[PDB]
Write a protein that binds this ligand. Structure first.
Ligand SMILES: [Mg+2]
Ligand SMILES: [Mg+2]
Ligand SMILES: [Mg+2]
Ligand SMILES: [Mg+2]
Ligand SMILES: [Mg+2]
Ligand SMILES: [Mg+2]
Ligand SMILES: [Mg+2]
Ligand SMILES: [Mg+2]
Ligand SMILES: [Mg+2]
Ligand SMILES: [Mg+2]
Ligand SMILES: [Mg+2]
Ligand SMILES: [Mg+2]
Ligand SMILES: [Mg+2]
Ligand SMILES: [Mg+2]
Ligand SMILES: [Mg+2]
Ligand SMILES: [Mg+2]
Ligand SMILES: [Mg+2]
Ligand SMILES: [Mg+2]
Ligand SMILES: [Mg+2]
Ligand SMILES: [Mg+2]
Ligand SMILES: [Mg+2]
Ligand SMILES: [Mg+2]
Ligand SMILES: [Mg+2]
Ligand SMILES: [Mg+2]
Ligand SMILES: [Mg+2]
Ligand SMILES: [Mg+2]
Ligand SMILES: [Mg+2]
Ligand SMILES: [Mg+2]
Ligand SMILES: [Mg+2]
Ligand SMILES: [Mg+2]
Ligand SMILES: [Mg+2]
Ligand SMILES: [Mg+2]
Ligand SMILES: [Mg+2]
Ligand SMILES: [Mg+2]
Ligand SMILES: [Mg+2]
Ligand SMILES: [Mg+2]
Ligand SMILES: [Mg+2]
Ligand SMILES: [Mg+2]
Ligand SMILES: [Mg+2]
Ligand SMILES: [Mg+2]
Ligand SMILES: [Mg+2]
Ligand SMILES: [Mg+2]
Ligand SMILES: [Mg+2]
Ligand SMILES: [Mg+2]
Ligand SMILES: [Mg+2]
Ligand SMILES: [Mg+2]
Ligand SMILES: [Mg+2]
Ligand SMILES: [Mg+2]
Ligand SMILES: [Mg+2]
Ligand SMILES: [Mg+2]
Ligand SMILES: [Mg+2]
Ligand SMILES: [Mg+2]
Ligand SMILES: [Mg+2]
Ligand SMILES: [Mg+2]
Ligand SMILES: [Mg+2]
Ligand SMILES: [Mg+2]
Ligand SMILES: [Mg+2]
Ligand SMILES: [Mg+2]
Ligand SMILES: [Mg+2]
Ligand SMILES: [Mg+2]
Ligand SMILES: [Mg+2]
Ligand SMILES: [Mg+2]
Ligand SMILES: [Mg+2]
Ligand SMILES: [Mg+2]
Ligand SMILES: [Mg+2]
Ligand SMILES: [Mg+2]
Ligand SMILES: [Mg+2]
Ligand SMILES: [Mg+2]
Ligand SMILES: [Mg+2]
Ligand SMILES: [Mg+2]
Lengths: 99, 83, 104
RNA sequence: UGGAGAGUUUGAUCCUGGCUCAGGGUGAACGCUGGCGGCGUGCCUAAGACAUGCAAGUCGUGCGGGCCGCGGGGUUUUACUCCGUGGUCAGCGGCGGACGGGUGAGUAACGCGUGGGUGACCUACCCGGAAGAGGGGGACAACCCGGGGAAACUCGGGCUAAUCCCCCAUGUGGACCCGCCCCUUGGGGUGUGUCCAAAGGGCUUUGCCCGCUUCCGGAUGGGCCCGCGUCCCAUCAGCUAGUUGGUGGGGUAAUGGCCCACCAAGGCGACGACGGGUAGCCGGUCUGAGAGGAUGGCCGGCCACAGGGGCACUGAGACACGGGCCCCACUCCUACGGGAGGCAGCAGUUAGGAAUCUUCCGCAAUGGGCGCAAGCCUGACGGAGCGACGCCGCUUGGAGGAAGAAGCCCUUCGGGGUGUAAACUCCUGAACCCGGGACGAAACCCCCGACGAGGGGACUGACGGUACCGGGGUAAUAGCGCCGGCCAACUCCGUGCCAGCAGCCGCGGUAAUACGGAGGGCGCGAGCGUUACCCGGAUUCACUGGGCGUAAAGGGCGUGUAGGCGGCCUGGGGCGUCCCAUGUGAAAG
């Protein structure tokens, strides 16, 4: 009985949530950003796409994402957005993309 | 983290250490990266500490970290002495 | 060095992929006689370029599928269908050797 | 530098051929016997089940408190209330818990071995280099209040600090899209755009110590991929539907049918696929003249497993032995709803077995974790303990002593043997007693110097009153196997194809060097025998190194597929083959 390093388990759960949520926000912001481009609404589109770019880079500050996991999440998202605007668009706000 | 430390090599009651570089998570007498000296504590022979400063210096230069004992032996064989 | 084998295309019935056959002469361990011995590699033909009969060099590469770990490095000589036919009879024989039915 | 053979098929012979013996080896067990030490080594079976204890924590120099003290303040006094300090308890937070220790159940597999790849990658702590930390907000335990449950534990309500979480800034720099250059797989630049930083603590208190942030490099440790090597059965010949490839996705640190949708119809196999059987692999180990054969036990490397089957969370790292969830089987508590366990860590118990150890001592050394340090924690480990289980060393005495005591033995009735053996004379002195008494240990820390180099000082021994040295000193354990041949060593008595022996051939039927006893003898000796197993002899699976007319063995004969093999001359290539250089071949052995 008893081994006071079940403190570790205790705090793993606390973290399980910090991460869980951070990730959730990225996924739903991303989908959203990509949905704004499949409707070709570039002003809003990049404006969100940018908020999600941030959300990713931030998650990778601590242990939620790190490395090139983030960098992946980023391009795979940034790519799909430019391309869905290529289907008739003209990057209005052109926030998070290169000329 | 890589160490510079004494691996145990004598026999019962007759200890001989082998000063080595190794990853700190190896078992004490296990696989090492490189031997760079030896040391008999009981001074049974006129030669009982040897080092090779250059290799010792080399490893230190890349963050080998010596146990408080290996450092004593290292120091004593003039590993540190800069004057 | 990325290992490089030379072989014979015995199959291109596959999108973007050849089956290069590579042989190796060597003295036998115990008995000393020289024995040939050969192995089929799947090679990446990205631009459906090489065709069966080609003799190609095959190069060790980061994996393209399972089975697929080589890319066709260059063309040596072409057309030589002898080895293709050679390899082809070899398997046609299998029709017998069984319990069932088929003229080998 | 290395190579021995013998016995047995016949009246006899040569040959063929099997069986057997002589050697070596052992994590052994068994019988008889048993004296001291050193060093090793010790569940081969039940990866059966496990009582009790101990086995991974640490940091007050990250933070705020609860309980118990002691002391000092604000008021004339009380009340309330402020500060300091000793002890203690957990909480929040950081690093460790992914190492170290255990096992070989599974696994015939890129698992292992060896050589390569990664332009397809990760790497906490450590080293080096470049640059930085400005402003602001939040929550949850602790604590306080209340509720449910037998219990494990559990729900709700209210405060709160931080090196906990968050938003803004600065952008050295990095990340992402698009373009351009170099490079050639996703490598290295470069431009616009967008995105991303930080934490404080300590003092000998304006400067140091320890931390934090971003980037580049190093070191060390890993992931993945590839060539070749890796047991038996063909009385297992066909196998495959994510199957084989494509495109696009998802996923990951990263490649990949790893997974998914859609498309093509492929992929593998007699060079043994598929199935079955067996097995952790290696360095090595035993044997062998060698080639080979056998093996993988101590130790070291890798892999796999942590009651059985799945799964993810947290993390630099886990699909996590002493972490989480679920299903199964089993033991335990139970107020019948429900809970608790997991020695293949150290000891230990029980079961199974021919058989395998102490519920020991110590953190003194070495190594590890956290800590600035002092320290703490280490059943890692260093030691002791049991067992002739193995190796090595050592004793049971040494010199004299009859022409040869006694007893037992034999005899040709003279004798001959045990035998210098004993007795006995002298000489050393294992055991045992007394005295001294270790090496292993010098660092961390402290002082001078500068917290560097360097110098000075102090503390520390489980083993252990041991090893070793000095003095005193007693004649003071010998067994076991064998004696027909192989194979060193023969004589009496008893027995009568019985009782028995026996590795093989074989002994015993009334004169037994073969059975049981005795005397004697041979061989080893704190051991000697036995049984079991591996190599050897066994050229008895033959590559080295065999055979097939009659000893075992030519397919009933052809035709021919694959495959093996292939005349003479010249030229190219350089796959095989040979040569030079160089890298690798860890340590142990
Ligand atoms: Mg949603
Ligand atoms: Mg005969
Ligand atoms: Mg005869
Ligand atoms: Mg014979
Ligand atoms: Mg006994
Ligand atoms: Mg012992
Ligand atoms: Mg076992
Ligand atoms: Mg228990
Ligand atoms: Mg303890
Ligand atoms: Mg505490
Ligand atoms: Mg282990
Ligand atoms: Mg199998
Ligand atoms: Mg693998
Ligand atoms: Mg690489
Ligand atoms: Mg640095
Ligand atoms: Mg504040
Ligand atoms: Mg309160
Ligand atoms: Mg609340
Ligand atoms: Mg507040
Ligand atoms: Mg910048
Ligand atoms: Mg920039
Ligand atoms: Mg390129
Ligand atoms: Mg670029
Ligand atoms: Mg910012
Ligand atoms: Mg400060
Ligand atoms: Mg590296
Ligand atoms: Mg398909
Ligand atoms: Mg893909
Ligand atoms: Mg794909
Ligand atoms: Mg098979
Ligand atoms: Mg196994
Ligand atoms: Mg071997
Ligand atoms: Mg031989
Ligand atoms: Mg074992
Ligand atoms: Mg082993
Ligand atoms: Mg068990
Ligand atoms: Mg993670
Ligand atoms: Mg346990
Ligand atoms: Mg029993
Ligand atoms: Mg210690
Ligand atoms: Mg220590
Ligand atoms: Mg005498
Ligand atoms: Mg004397
Ligand atoms: Mg005397
Ligand atoms: Mg100390
Ligand atoms: Mg000073
Ligand atoms: Mg000093
Ligand atoms: Mg005597
Ligand atoms: Mg004789
Ligand atoms: Mg007589
Ligand atoms: Mg009788
Ligand atoms: Mg008689
Ligand atoms: Mg007779
Ligand atoms: Mg006799
Ligand atoms: Mg006999
Ligand atoms: Mg021999
Ligand atoms: Mg042989
Ligand atoms: Mg023969
Ligand atoms: Mg006949
Ligand atoms: Mg015959
Ligand atoms: Mg014939
Ligand atoms: Mg026939
Ligand atoms: Mg016949
Ligand atoms: Mg013919
Ligand atoms: Mg032919
Ligand atoms: Mg030919
Ligand atoms: Mg020829
Ligand atoms: Mg020629
Ligand atoms: Mg050549
Ligand atoms: Mg070696």
């Amino acid at each position: 009985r008893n081994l006071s390093a079940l403190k570790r388990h205790r705090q793993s759960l606390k973290r399980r949530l910090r991460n869980k949520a951070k990730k959730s926000a990225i996924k739903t912001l991303s989908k959203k950003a990509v949905q704004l481009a499949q409707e070709g609404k570039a002003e809003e589109a990049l404006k969100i796409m940018r908020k999600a770019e941030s959300l990713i880079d931030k998650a990778a500050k601590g242990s939620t994402l790190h490395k090139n996991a983030a960098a992946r999440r980023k391009s795979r998202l940034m790519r799909k957005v430019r391309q869905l605007l290529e289907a008739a668009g003209a990057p209005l706000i052109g926030g998070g993309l290169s000329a | 983290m890589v160490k510079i430390r004494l691996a145990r090599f004598g026999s019962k009651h007759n200890p001989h250490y082998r000063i080595v570089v190794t990853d700190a998570r190896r078992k004490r007498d296990g696989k090492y990266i490189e031997k760079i000296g030896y040391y008999d504590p009981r001074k049974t022979t006129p030669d009982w500490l040897k080092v090779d400063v250059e290799r010792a210096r080399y490893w230190l230069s890349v963050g080998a970290q010596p146990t408080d004992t290996a450092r004593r032996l290292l120091r004593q064989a003039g590993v540190f002495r800069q004057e | 060095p990325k290992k490089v084998l030379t072989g014979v295309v015995v199959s291109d019935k596959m999108q973007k992929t050849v089956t290069v056959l590579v042989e190796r002469q060597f003295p036998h361990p115990l008995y000393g006689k020289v024995i040939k011995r050969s192995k089929k590699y799947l090679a990446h033909d990205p631009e459906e370029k090489y065709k069966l009969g080609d003799v190609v060099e095959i190069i060790e590469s980061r994996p393209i599928s399972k089975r697929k770990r080589f890319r066709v490095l260059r063309l040596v000589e072409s057309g030589r269908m002898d080895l293709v036919e050679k390899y082809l009879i070899r398997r046609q024989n299998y029709q017998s050797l069984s319990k069932r039915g088929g003229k080998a």
